[PDB]
């Protein structure tokens, strides 16, 4: 969504689903040619780390850093932690007609 000051508001999920498809296309480019096996296994475990980070990032000892110098929040953190998609919008949420 564009903001009032012309700034853009994108998600980190966009970055995850962008990098996964980028390295999937790079794996396709490496497998369509005669590549060394070290390069192939490197691309394979990079794809493995990226897919398992897109599933749940940051429950092991090391996570993805370097977005905005904060540790990364994944799609499972909307459900698991204190942010709580359940607790915020499923068993109680914002309703109209009120005042205090």
């Amino acid at each position: 969504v564009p903001l009032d000051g012309g700034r853009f508001a994108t998600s980190d999920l966009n970055d995850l689903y962008r990098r996964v498809i980028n390295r999937n296309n790079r794996l396709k480019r490496l497998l369509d040619l005669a590549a060394p096996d070290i390069i192939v296994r490197n691309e394979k475990r990079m794809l493995q780390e990226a897919v398992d980070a897109l599933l749940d990032n940051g429950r092991r000892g090391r996570a993805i850093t370097g977005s905005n110098k904060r540790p990364l929040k994944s799609l499972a953190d909307m459900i698991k932690g204190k942010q709580g998609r359940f607790r915020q919008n499923l068993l109680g949420k914002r309703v109209d007609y009120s005042g205090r």
Partner: protein, 100 residues
């Protein structure tokens, strides 16, 4: 919705290091060997026609070079999730449940 044409198969993170490694509970193999095979550290024997080794036997970089130049034409081994999905395809449930 949409899908991604994903070539090299990747395991699910909520099954491997999550309690209590259901792969090791269904295949009767310790989770340390699962973490070593699925992180490209060593090979694993899927199914061998010879009487040298059996199923769920890991092989390092030296042991595979020691066992490769002697025998052949009946030994099948992969590195990564391909060996695990082939082992889950080639296994049976009824005979294992009868043995248990």
């Amino acid at each position: 919705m949409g899908h991604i044409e994903l070539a090299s198969p990747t395991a699910h993170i909520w099954f491997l290091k999550s309690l209590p490694s259901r792969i090791g509970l269904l295949l009767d193999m310790p989770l340390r060997d699962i973490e070593r095979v699925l992180y490209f550290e060593s090979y694993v024997v899927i199914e061998g026609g010879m009487t040298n080794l059996e199923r769920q036997q890991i092989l390092t970089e030296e042991q595979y070079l020691d066992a490769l130049e002697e025998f052949g034409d009946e030994f099948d081994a992969k590195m990564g999730a391909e060996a695990i999905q082939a082992l889950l395809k080639s296994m049976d449930l009824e005979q294992e449940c009868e043995q248990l």
